[PDB]
Design a protein around this ligand. Structure first.
Ligand SMILES: [Cl-]
Ligand SMILES: [Cl-]
Ligand SMILES: [Cl-]
Ligand SMILES: [Cl-]
Lengths: 509, 509, 509, 509
């Protein structure tokens, strides 16, 4: 008894990873393939939401910066017109003691009060002298910090902030992931800037970036999926996978439709995957992994963009006068993230939480803020108060004046938000992934392969591409196994049009 | 006016590199392609010669050990029968003061005289204490040695030997190439073995290897080429390339035949390539590169294999009592490298270089030795005395008794022998290679891309494979740009039968 | 009501320290003075005992080596004849696994079995690499060892031996005292000797020494005291101090005699001193100090000196096959330490502990051995079995053959044997000593000032001298406060005849 | 034929050293003794001069701070009245780029311009990282500096200043003398003060000091000598030593008087001593020593003490806009160093070097400045222009306004000023001193024993004391042989009234 549908390569999930697989499969045009997703709209965590008032809110204000030329080719193909994109310079600060400290914090001590300046440069002189002599290697995130930064910067910013975002103490996670995330402060450069009162905030791959004019990031993946053959897609309740039988290589959908495959590329959360396989063993293994939930909070406000805010992009909040670890001036990314000035909206409340003087609709214009709050078994949150708490914090930090008029509110909780790089991670992955591989299953993605080091949109897209390239042309999966390798180079070899296609075209003629 | 022949991808040279290109082109079966070589017999430097007496002699006694599963697949395909191959354990020693010191030398100080033992462990204690504190990096080969080994091992073996083989002083070459060539001695392990009088010679990828039963290594590449479509090859005076016009992408052969190409894979020496292009600039660049010539000397001798020699494979000779830097007991690799016992041969001379007592042709059996002597502008040799000199050295080292009967002699000089890893190398390559790339020319191979780190047979084969995989499927050329990456891992992803081929068969059916 | 006797400077105790005080007082001939001791025979711990059979036994076989020229002057004065002294070369070994390892142990690894050789040179390479980089300081004896020697030499000899002698673990004592006691092994020198199989045993101030012909060391201090004016001494039950009243500066003897003083030099144990003062506070302070008791065991044996023993002086026994930590071939120091060959003595028992064949007395000659066994609250001993145990150990170590005839036995327990350099020591001394100083009381000596670093006979003698020189001419007490200073130099300034005397005798005439 | 005079101990020179010898000789009252000097007024380099206008000028503005309680006793005895002494807090600065940098310079980088601040903290971070790893020792003064300070502070202040004072480059002197002279900057403390803009100038034994009310320092040694028995002194042309016959221990004075001695204490310059002995050998040895001459310049000026100067004591001048290396506000030490306000004096010239408008005698009050200029064969000076040059420099540094009225000028050149701690010094001393010792000659003092480390007034006094204490009571000469020992402790043992005298007094009664 055959299955209803049979293909060479089946792709579960239409996030950036699944779509990466589809794109290369479609470019190659060899093996038969199909892609499914439980949602009518492709995009996954990189999709966009909208309030009844007309305010767009991503899942933490995503920003596009690419390590791969192939990733660029697909974006250019889906959104080829100049006015589809905005190019921005990164403006980021850290809130510490009534001060905006330029990112990255550890490179701009010259912007702290004199007292803290002293405590930071002292712990940093200590660390520099020991690091001159050490020959072992840091084993925890906390160790890495102390050795690279000093106990001063650690107690002032690093320790408190990272718990506020990762939802676990720095002592409980590894330090092999931060190659391109955490800057390592140079003693000379930092004290030279303290003496001269200068800043240095060009560090990182974030320095410059771009953002889609309309639809947010979610609009990118809708455009990208539109380049695929409709008949090879299956999005919605009709494409929801509820069972995976690795032994006879068949998938069962929600409606009972069965699909047979030779190779499986699964981009759903690995822990859900194991559950869908009824594989008691893999379940016991996945439960050894750790993740944190993400609360996204959106606030629409009336008025021209205050100068107290200016051209700021995103901001970190280590202190405990607010529940969120970051805030984004979303309205700065594109004028289409919020209604036009001519649209009339009523005031729901003032920043201080009281009612408005007038229950009528008035003109704008408007600007928008979005916040993020982390949660775990080590850091619970109260959903029915988190929204109000976030607004209070906006006042306590002077983001909003108590009299500022709030026009729109937004709150959503994403269960799987961050793949936590705990100490136990690699212990579980080096078992889980190979075991799945032996069943011809390539589990890839942010929660497919569970590796933050390489868990951005471009990374995920390429995890899908390379998985397919591995199944078809026997390419090595560099992104999955060698983060530091891909992240440290310009990946310019693989293109949306390779020689294989050019030589096929010149043949057909 | 069109060219006589036109193909998508043209491959110049049928050495291991050229044949690697052909093999993957043929496996993919997409773009049109052709391969040419100036010699009727494919194999290049990995080919075999024969004396009128029936003695086989490689080009320095080559040995097969593979980093790539794909390389294995092709070898298994060409020589699929068990009795086509012999598997050997590496037996190698170094001649120092009437002693056979187990390879690698620096790990077996426990086998030197007491006096030298002391001078070696002293310089090695010094180096170990400084290396505990250094934070810079060695810039020359000589520095690397002193830092990793000590001044004792350097003056006793490293310095004198390396000049004897590389044909230039250690102070004039870099140290980025030796990752898998030069062992780094551990202080504890070495002194622990000096106290206990033990050996340690398992180090390196040479430990175990295999060798073809018939035809030497040259037989492998003849078998491999036989798997290609004859009509797509052109070997002999008819396939010799005498002109390359990069501007209009045409090659001109010896007979005047012209070939047009879209992509060019050239495996000939890069300096000859530049000359064939009449590109004055590239010529001036190539001349900045450095290489050494190789003299191969073969000696056939009568008698059962002496016990003074036993199951020895190859031997290094640092001292100055002989001109050669290495010697191979070729007759140990396969019984088919020399005549059978029943064959009758006359004696040409005795080891001491005097006439034999009998000129009459007698039976055997026989064994065989081959030697290597390096040459450069920094180390000239006398061709008309080198043969005699080599034999004398065989006596001075007690390899041959002065009365041993010599049945066959062999001598040949290969101009391009070693690609010298000088200090100036990367300065020239980072210009030459990219400039050729801009003309759609992939120059690859031992003297195609000129990188010893990755200049073995398997390496070369894969430089050709990956070049093609780059032109067609946009794969990254890992071997060419990341020697330490490929050399440190098991490259098991790329096979002779990939999914693209598996799927295409199940589709035809 | 005046005291029966009144002097400027009173000296309690006629040990080497007390006698040092007396000697300088007598040389200066200024202030009035008197010296008392509870024993008819002066000498203290440096006195000698005798068995009814005619065997001399010191208190652990003392050996004379001087840091001070002044100490030499007094010895030359008391024993001026060439034949009063024997000069010896130090012959010392350590018993480890059926081997005699030349002193010092850590400098002669070349004399251990091959297996232990490896374990010792490994821990020593580790230590040498860390010591290259450390910048802190060792805080315990155990730390000092590990850092200077390695964990190999520590577990094999250092740790077990030191507990066997000090009667407390190495982890519970400081490391400021070992400057001239514990050798610091040089990595180069030690491995150079392991390769060549050489020894190095010239280290220390013990290398060469002398020993008195008659009476043992006790004979020296009897001769020295004989140079003092009899009327200023008071030795015996008549000189025993039973009460010290610091407030009104009076001492009360056993017979009720009272002595008044201006300055007091007390050489008795500081803890007994505090008790004699009825000073509740000082008592509580002294009890914070730590000491170990010493068991001295003497064995006289018949026969010419075996060659298994030869010219050996003293030997250390780290292993647990015997209770003693050291043994001395006392009969080697002087022919007068035991009876002459012509003396007839009966056999008491054989080494194996069995009855003798005959009771009748027979000639000699004889040789002698003395042993030392430590005791503390951390290491109890059984007095009524220790003698037998010691003999058994002499058999287990092959010092005596089970059939060797024992002629004389000796056993005595000295309560205050070693001033233990615990971690708490300096904490108590820096309080006790100054508090006594404020009452014009100079407490000096092995148990007077309780500092092993400077607790040899010459040290003690000079503690007395310098105390008097401090009271009279305001000299600094270098020996008491700066052990490393005096021990590292040739103290040649102070003589038995200073300019004062030579200038006063040229005055009279 | 006997000498005219005979004593046990003869002391040549009545400087602080000679007088120290006399004082202890007189206190002991044993051996006979006598002290001679070529000058009617005792004091040596520690004496005071006076201008016809009534201005006192020392030999570089001397300042009293004591390491020895014995030194205090003698000063208290000679000047026992409270109002004989003034107690001062040290106020010292360094002139660098129109800035007064608090002493010590290296500890107050926080007071330099921003540009120099950076160059100093950079070289200091380098040095701190290397010093973390070094295990050798600095061999030259220059090395010591670079290692302890950095190349920044070295080029800015250390190198140029030290040549200006020592009269030789820093590369030509040793670094064993600076223990209590040159501060070693702590990286943390210095950057902590740069961030906070604080100062730290409590370092050194100079922090607090005292100064005699009248007569300058010269008044101290006149008072001290007045405590000696006149008949045992011989000061003036009658006490000038012109010949020393070590062989028959006799000294010949200027008038022909001969003195016989048993022990000789010579405080004159060791090179002059050798000359007076006619000892060709010692002469050749002394000439291997190095010294620099000192020019003292005194300037008296009219007016109330400007505020531009305030309570400043002494100031260093590294820059090249003036010839002097230091300046002292002598009028701040005591109101008796210059005339009273009521005294009338004519103006000799204005600071700018031009005539005054008035050849007229007017009132005061007045203040005083004295300068020091070094000279050697490596740094010549022009005597007939140095006075003018010094005044010009006072203007260029803004010490004096060009219009300031000069009332008194003073200039004198002292040939032997500084005992240069060259590299060759200890090579010569370890020969010269012992050779003299073998002739019963204690050569002590600034130029007697030639050791700057211990060349202050208190040091010199004690060199004399200890020399006598050595000759008489056999005390060790700690000061002469162990600078770091005496300088690092409180020498409280030796008093002007020792027990020998207390006991001798209670006996006479
Ligand atoms: Cl690949
Ligand atoms: Cl074969
Ligand atoms: Cl690739
Ligand atoms: Cl002394």
């Amino acid at each position: 008894t055959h299955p209803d549908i049979s293909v060479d390569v089946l792709v579960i999930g239409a996030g950036p990873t699944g779509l990466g697989a589809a794109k290369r499969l479609n470019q190659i045009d060899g093996p038969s393939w199909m892609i499914v997703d439980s949602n009518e709209t492709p995009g996954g965590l990189a999709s966009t939401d909208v309030t009844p008032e007309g305010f767009l809110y991503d899942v933490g204000g995503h920003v596009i910066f690419s390590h791969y030329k192939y990733f660029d080719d697909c974006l250019d193909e889906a959104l080829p017109k100049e006015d589809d994109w905005y190019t921005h310079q990164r403006i980021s600060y850290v809130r510490c003691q009534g001060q905006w400290v330029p990112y990255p914090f550890q490179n701009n001590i010259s912007m702290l009060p004199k007292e803290e300046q002293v405590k930071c440069i002292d712990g940093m002189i200590d660390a520099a002298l020991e690091a001159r002599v050490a020959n072992t290697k840091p084993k925890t995130f906390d160790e890495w910090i102390v050795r690279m930064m000093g106990t001063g910067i650690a107690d002032l910013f690093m320790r408190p902030y990272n718990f506020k975002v990762w939802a676990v103490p720095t002592t409980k996670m590894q330090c092999a992931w931060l190659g391109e995330r955490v800057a390592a402060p140079n003693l000379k450069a930092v004290t030279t800037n303290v003496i001269l009162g200068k800043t240095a905030g060009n560090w990182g791959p974030n320095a410059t970036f771009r953002f889609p004019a309309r639809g947010g990031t979610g609009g990118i993946w809708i455009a990208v999926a539109n380049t695929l053959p409709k008949e090879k897609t299956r999005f919605g309740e009709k494409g929801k996978v509820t069972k995976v039988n690795a032994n006879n290589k068949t998938v069962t959908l929600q409606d009972g439709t069965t699909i047979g495959y030779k190779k499986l590329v699964s981009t759903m959360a690995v822990d859900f995957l194991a559950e869908a396989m009824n594989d008691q063993e893999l379940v016991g293994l996945t439960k050894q992994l750790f993740y944190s939930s993400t609360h996204v909070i959106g606030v629409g406000v009336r008025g021209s963009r205050p100068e107290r805010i200016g051209d700021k992009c995103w901001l970190y909040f280590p202190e405990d006068n607010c529940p969120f670890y970051r805030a984004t001036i979303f309205s700065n990314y594109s004028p289409y993230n919020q209604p036009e000035a001519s649209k009339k909206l009523p005031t729901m409340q003032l920043a201080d939480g009281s009612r408005p003087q007038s229950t009528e609709a008035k003109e704008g214009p408007y600007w928008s803020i979005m916040l993020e709050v982390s949660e775990s078994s080590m850091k619970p949150v109260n959903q029915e108060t988190i929204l109000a708490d976030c607004i209070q914090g906006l006042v306590n930090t002077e983001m909003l004046k108590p009299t500022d008029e709030i026009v729109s509110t937004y709150h959503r909780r994403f269960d799987h938000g961050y793949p936590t790089p705990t100490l136990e991670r690699e212990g579980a992955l080096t078992q889980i992934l190979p075991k799945l591989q032996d069943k011809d299953i390539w589990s890839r993605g942010r929660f497919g392969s569970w590796r933050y080091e390489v868990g951005n949109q471009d990374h995920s897209f390429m995890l899908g591409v390379e998985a397919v390239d591995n199944i078809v042309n026997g390419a090595v999966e560099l992104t999955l196994n060698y983060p530091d390798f891909v992240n440290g180079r310009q990946n310019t070899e693989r293109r949306l049009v390779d020689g294989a296609q050019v030589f096929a075209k010149s043949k057909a003629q």
